[PDB]
Amino acid sequence: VSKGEETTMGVIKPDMKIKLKMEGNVNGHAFVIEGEGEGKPYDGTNTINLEVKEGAPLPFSYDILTTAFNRAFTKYPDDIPNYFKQSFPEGYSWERTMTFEDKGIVKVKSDISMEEDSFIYEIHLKGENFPPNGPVMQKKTTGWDASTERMYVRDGVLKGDVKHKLLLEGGGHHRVDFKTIYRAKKAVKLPDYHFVDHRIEILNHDKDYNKVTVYESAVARNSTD
Amino acid sequence: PGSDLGKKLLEAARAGQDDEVRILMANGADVNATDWVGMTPLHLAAWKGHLEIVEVLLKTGADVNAHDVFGTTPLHLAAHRGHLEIVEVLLKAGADVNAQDMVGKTPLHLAAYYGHLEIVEVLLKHGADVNAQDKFGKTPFDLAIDNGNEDIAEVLQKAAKLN
C-alpha cells in the first residue's frame, strides 16, 4: 500500500459494500431500482446487483442506467490528489447530463454517503426525448465502449467529461457526451488535469433486465501517461 | 437566463453563505437563477435549512413553486429534511401543498417517509391529500409503514377516515 493510499485507509477500507436506490423516469415511464454490491476502492473495481422494484418491465435500454450505478472506486496513483476518497466520511454528490446522438437526454444526480463499511447512493434519473424507434427505446444497444473521462477543476469543484460511444446491435455505435460535476462535501486537495479510464459491463441479467449485475473498472492516470 | 451574478447566488445559497447572498441580491442577482438540473437559490436555501435566506428570497420575488428537472419543489425539499419553519413559510407564500414530483411523490409522502411528524401535521392542516398515490400506487401511509414510522402511520390512517 502506497503512502497516498494509506492516508484514507482509516475511512475507506480495501473492501467496501454498496447500497443504492434510484428513482427514475424515462420518456414518462417511472420506475425504482434498488442495488446492493461491493467493490475494491483502491483497485478501482465495483460490482452491483440491481433489482427493478417498481415500474417493471422497463421499456428502454438498461445501458442508459448503468453508469449511474461512484468514483471512490478508482485506482489512483499517489501523485494525483484523490478528490473522491478525500471527501469521506462526509462524502460527495454528483450531477450529470448525457446527451445522445439522436437528441435523447439523461439528467441524473446522486448523493454518495458512507455508513460503517458501506457506500450509500441516492440517485434520481430522468430520460427525455428518446425517439420511440431509436435504439434506446427499441432496446438495440449492446453496452458501452471503454472510455476515458477527462477530470479537471472548475469553480472549485471537479468536472468530468466523456466523449462516449454506446454500442449497438449489428456493430454500429451511438455517440453520447457525458458532463459531470463532482462536489465534495468538505474541502479537499484539488487535482490537476487527469484521465480516468473506464470499462463498464453487464455481467448478467434476466430476460427483462429486472435483475442485472453491473461491473466497472476505473483507473486514473496523467495525460502524459 | 443564465448570468454571472446568478451563478454566484446559486453557489452562495448552496454554500449557506447568508451574507454573500445578501450582497449578491443587493447588486442585482437574479433570485430565480436556475442551474442545469433546475435548482434555484430557494431550493438550495430550503434544503440547507437557512430560514432567513428563504424569507428574503421569497420577499424579493423567488418562485415558491419552482420545480427542478426531477419535479422537486422547495416544499418537497423542506419536508424531506424536516425544516418545520421553512415549510410554514413556504406554505404561507403560496407553495402547492400537493405538488407531485416526477415519480408522483408529494411533500406529505416525503415527510412521512423521513419521519417528520410535526411537518406531516402542518401539511395535513393545509389540505395535503392523505390518499395521494405516487406513480407506483403508494400513499404517504404506505411509506410511513415501510420506514417504520408508526406514529405518523396512525396520524395518516386516522385522517384517511371518510364520512
PDB file of C-alpha atoms in Angstrom, chain A residues 71-198:
ATOM      1  CA  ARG A  71     -15.518   7.370  -8.349  1.00  0.00           C
ATOM      2  CA  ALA A  72     -14.371   6.325  -4.882  1.00  0.00           C
ATOM      3  CA  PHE A  73     -13.920   3.053  -6.810  1.00  0.00           C
ATOM      4  CA  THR A  74     -10.987   4.337  -8.856  1.00  0.00           C
ATOM      5  CA  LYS A  75      -7.356   3.289  -8.726  1.00  0.00           C
ATOM      6  CA  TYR A  76      -5.324   6.477  -8.219  1.00  0.00           C
ATOM      7  CA  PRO A  77      -1.549   6.988  -8.298  1.00  0.00           C
ATOM      8  CA  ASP A  78      -0.089   8.900  -5.380  1.00  0.00           C
ATOM      9  CA  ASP A  79       0.948  11.898  -7.478  1.00  0.00           C
ATOM     10  CA  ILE A  80      -2.683  12.734  -8.394  1.00  0.00           C
ATOM     11  CA  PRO A  81      -4.787  14.016  -5.456  1.00  0.00           C
ATOM     12  CA  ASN A  82      -7.816  11.763  -4.993  1.00  0.00           C
ATOM     13  CA  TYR A  83     -10.813  14.103  -4.939  1.00  0.00           C
ATOM     14  CA  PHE A  84     -13.259  11.312  -4.124  1.00  0.00           C
ATOM     15  CA  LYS A  85     -11.529   9.351  -1.379  1.00  0.00           C
ATOM     16  CA  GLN A  86     -10.503  12.569   0.400  1.00  0.00           C
ATOM     17  CA  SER A  87     -14.158  13.615   0.640  1.00  0.00           C
ATOM     18  CA  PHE A  88     -15.087  10.825   3.039  1.00  0.00           C
ATOM     19  CA  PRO A  89     -16.568  10.143   5.538  1.00  0.00           C
ATOM     20  CA  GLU A  90     -18.693  13.199   4.689  1.00  0.00           C
ATOM     21  CA  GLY A  91     -18.847  12.189   1.034  1.00  0.00           C
ATOM     22  CA  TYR A  92     -19.745  13.947  -2.176  1.00  0.00           C
ATOM     23  CA  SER A  93     -22.538  14.364  -4.683  1.00  0.00           C
ATOM     24  CA  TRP A  94     -22.574  14.462  -8.451  1.00  0.00           C
ATOM     25  CA  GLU A  95     -24.737  15.823 -11.246  1.00  0.00           C
ATOM     26  CA  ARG A  96     -24.534  14.558 -14.795  1.00  0.00           C
ATOM     27  CA  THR A  97     -26.032  15.119 -18.225  1.00  0.00           C
ATOM     28  CA  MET A  98     -25.744  12.595 -21.049  1.00  0.00           C
ATOM     29  CA  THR A  99     -26.589  13.960 -24.498  1.00  0.00           C
ATOM     30  CA  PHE A 100     -27.335  11.296 -27.101  1.00  0.00           C
ATOM     31  CA  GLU A 101     -26.748  11.457 -30.838  1.00  0.00           C
ATOM     32  CA  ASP A 102     -30.486  11.292 -31.667  1.00  0.00           C
ATOM     33  CA  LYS A 103     -31.344  14.035 -29.116  1.00  0.00           C
ATOM     34  CA  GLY A 104     -32.314  11.796 -26.235  1.00  0.00           C
ATOM     35  CA  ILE A 105     -31.055  13.268 -22.982  1.00  0.00           C
ATOM     36  CA  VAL A 106     -30.484  11.906 -19.491  1.00  0.00           C
ATOM     37  CA  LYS A 107     -30.087  14.115 -16.424  1.00  0.00           C
ATOM     38  CA  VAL A 108     -29.054  12.325 -13.259  1.00  0.00           C
ATOM     39  CA  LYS A 109     -27.833  13.248  -9.807  1.00  0.00           C
ATOM     40  CA  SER A 110     -26.519  11.134  -6.976  1.00  0.00           C
ATOM     41  CA  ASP A 111     -25.669  11.604  -3.320  1.00  0.00           C
ATOM     42  CA  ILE A 112     -22.790   9.384  -2.135  1.00  0.00           C
ATOM     43  CA  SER A 113     -22.614   8.827   1.624  1.00  0.00           C
ATOM     44  CA  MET A 114     -20.938   6.305   3.913  1.00  0.00           C
ATOM     45  CA  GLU A 115     -22.257   4.194   6.782  1.00  0.00           C
ATOM     46  CA  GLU A 116     -19.904   1.805   8.560  1.00  0.00           C
ATOM     47  CA  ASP A 117     -18.257  -0.260   5.775  1.00  0.00           C
ATOM     48  CA  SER A 118     -20.740   0.674   3.022  1.00  0.00           C
ATOM     49  CA  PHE A 119     -21.252   3.423   0.497  1.00  0.00           C
ATOM     50  CA  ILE A 120     -24.878   4.512   0.121  1.00  0.00           C
ATOM     51  CA  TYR A 121     -26.202   6.180  -3.047  1.00  0.00           C
ATOM     52  CA  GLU A 122     -29.440   8.096  -3.545  1.00  0.00           C
ATOM     53  CA  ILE A 123     -29.962   8.530  -7.288  1.00  0.00           C
ATOM     54  CA  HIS A 124     -32.521  10.445  -9.346  1.00  0.00           C
ATOM     55  CA  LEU A 125     -32.529   9.958 -13.118  1.00  0.00           C
ATOM     56  CA  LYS A 126     -34.658  11.484 -15.853  1.00  0.00           C
ATOM     57  CA  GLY A 127     -34.520  10.498 -19.518  1.00  0.00           C
ATOM     58  CA  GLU A 128     -36.383  12.548 -22.117  1.00  0.00           C
ATOM     59  CA  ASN A 129     -36.913  12.872 -25.865  1.00  0.00           C
ATOM     60  CA  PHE A 130     -35.689   9.409 -26.869  1.00  0.00           C
ATOM     61  CA  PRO A 131     -37.121   8.575 -30.314  1.00  0.00           C
ATOM     62  CA  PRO A 132     -39.528   5.626 -29.947  1.00  0.00           C
ATOM     63  CA  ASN A 133     -37.930   3.848 -32.892  1.00  0.00           C
ATOM     64  CA  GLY A 134     -34.369   4.601 -31.770  1.00  0.00           C
ATOM     65  CA  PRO A 135     -32.000   2.077 -30.184  1.00  0.00           C
ATOM     66  CA  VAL A 136     -32.670   3.115 -26.578  1.00  0.00           C
ATOM     67  CA  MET A 137     -36.446   2.665 -26.699  1.00  0.00           C
ATOM     68  CA  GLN A 138     -36.144  -0.355 -29.008  1.00  0.00           C
ATOM     69  CA  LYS A 139     -33.549  -1.990 -26.707  1.00  0.00           C
ATOM     70  CA  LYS A 140     -30.998  -2.387 -29.506  1.00  0.00           C
ATOM     71  CA  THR A 141     -27.885  -1.410 -27.524  1.00  0.00           C
ATOM     72  CA  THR A 142     -25.229  -3.912 -26.519  1.00  0.00           C
ATOM     73  CA  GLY A 143     -23.204  -1.934 -23.983  1.00  0.00           C
ATOM     74  CA  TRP A 144     -20.769   0.918 -23.554  1.00  0.00           C
ATOM     75  CA  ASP A 145     -17.371   1.013 -25.192  1.00  0.00           C
ATOM     76  CA  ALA A 146     -14.365   1.501 -22.964  1.00  0.00           C
ATOM     77  CA  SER A 147     -13.985   5.207 -22.242  1.00  0.00           C
ATOM     78  CA  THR A 148     -11.687   7.900 -20.931  1.00  0.00           C
ATOM     79  CA  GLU A 149     -13.110  10.579 -18.654  1.00  0.00           C
ATOM     80  CA  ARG A 150     -11.235  13.885 -18.547  1.00  0.00           C
ATOM     81  CA  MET A 151     -11.124  15.216 -14.970  1.00  0.00           C
ATOM     82  CA  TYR A 152     -10.339  18.862 -14.270  1.00  0.00           C
ATOM     83  CA  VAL A 153     -11.207  21.555 -11.733  1.00  0.00           C
ATOM     84  CA  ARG A 154     -13.558  24.441 -12.435  1.00  0.00           C
ATOM     85  CA  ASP A 155     -15.147  26.767  -9.893  1.00  0.00           C
ATOM     86  CA  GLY A 156     -13.517  24.931  -7.006  1.00  0.00           C
ATOM     87  CA  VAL A 157     -15.115  21.565  -7.827  1.00  0.00           C
ATOM     88  CA  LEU A 158     -14.225  18.662 -10.101  1.00  0.00           C
ATOM     89  CA  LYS A 159     -15.642  18.284 -13.604  1.00  0.00           C
ATOM     90  CA  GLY A 160     -15.548  15.162 -15.740  1.00  0.00           C
ATOM     91  CA  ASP A 161     -16.192  14.925 -19.495  1.00  0.00           C
ATOM     92  CA  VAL A 162     -16.599  11.775 -21.614  1.00  0.00           C
ATOM     93  CA  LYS A 163     -16.898  11.571 -25.380  1.00  0.00           C
ATOM     94  CA  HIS A 164     -18.662   8.224 -25.165  1.00  0.00           C
ATOM     95  CA  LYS A 165     -19.929   5.537 -27.542  1.00  0.00           C
ATOM     96  CA  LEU A 166     -22.984   3.394 -26.931  1.00  0.00           C
ATOM     97  CA  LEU A 167     -22.548   0.208 -28.920  1.00  0.00           C
ATOM     98  CA  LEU A 168     -25.453  -1.067 -30.999  1.00  0.00           C
ATOM     99  CA  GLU A 169     -26.754  -4.410 -32.151  1.00  0.00           C
ATOM    100  CA  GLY A 170     -25.226  -5.086 -35.550  1.00  0.00           C
ATOM    101  CA  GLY A 171     -21.934  -3.288 -34.863  1.00  0.00           C
ATOM    102  CA  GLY A 172     -22.821   0.403 -35.084  1.00  0.00           C
ATOM    103  CA  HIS A 173     -22.434   2.951 -32.356  1.00  0.00           C
ATOM    104  CA  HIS A 174     -24.252   5.935 -30.934  1.00  0.00           C
ATOM    105  CA  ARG A 175     -22.297   8.957 -29.697  1.00  0.00           C
ATOM    106  CA  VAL A 176     -23.134  10.120 -26.168  1.00  0.00           C
ATOM    107  CA  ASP A 177     -21.477  13.085 -24.443  1.00  0.00           C
ATOM    108  CA  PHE A 178     -21.177  12.928 -20.643  1.00  0.00           C
ATOM    109  CA  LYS A 179     -20.678  16.010 -18.494  1.00  0.00           C
ATOM    110  CA  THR A 180     -20.451  15.533 -14.724  1.00  0.00           C
ATOM    111  CA  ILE A 181     -19.958  17.867 -11.768  1.00  0.00           C
ATOM    112  CA  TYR A 182     -18.484  16.212  -8.669  1.00  0.00           C
ATOM    113  CA  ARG A 183     -18.884  18.178  -5.404  1.00  0.00           C
ATOM    114  CA  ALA A 184     -17.068  17.122  -2.234  1.00  0.00           C
ATOM    115  CA  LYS A 185     -18.923  17.935   0.981  1.00  0.00           C
ATOM    116  CA  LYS A 186     -15.753  19.325   2.558  1.00  0.00           C
ATOM    117  CA  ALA A 187     -12.526  20.969   1.484  1.00  0.00           C
ATOM    118  CA  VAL A 188     -10.098  18.545  -0.192  1.00  0.00           C
ATOM    119  CA  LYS A 189      -6.810  18.895  -2.038  1.00  0.00           C
ATOM    120  CA  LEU A 190      -7.675  19.547  -5.682  1.00  0.00           C
ATOM    121  CA  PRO A 191      -6.092  17.565  -8.545  1.00  0.00           C
ATOM    122  CA  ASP A 192      -4.645  18.887 -11.767  1.00  0.00           C
ATOM    123  CA  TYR A 193      -5.990  17.773 -15.139  1.00  0.00           C
ATOM    124  CA  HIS A 194      -6.047  13.984 -15.494  1.00  0.00           C
ATOM    125  CA  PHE A 195      -7.797  10.989 -17.072  1.00  0.00           C
ATOM    126  CA  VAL A 196      -9.903   8.163 -15.670  1.00  0.00           C
ATOM    127  CA  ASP A 197     -10.157   5.129 -17.958  1.00  0.00           C
ATOM    128  CA  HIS A 198     -13.386   3.144 -17.541  1.00  0.00           C
TER     129      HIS A 198
END
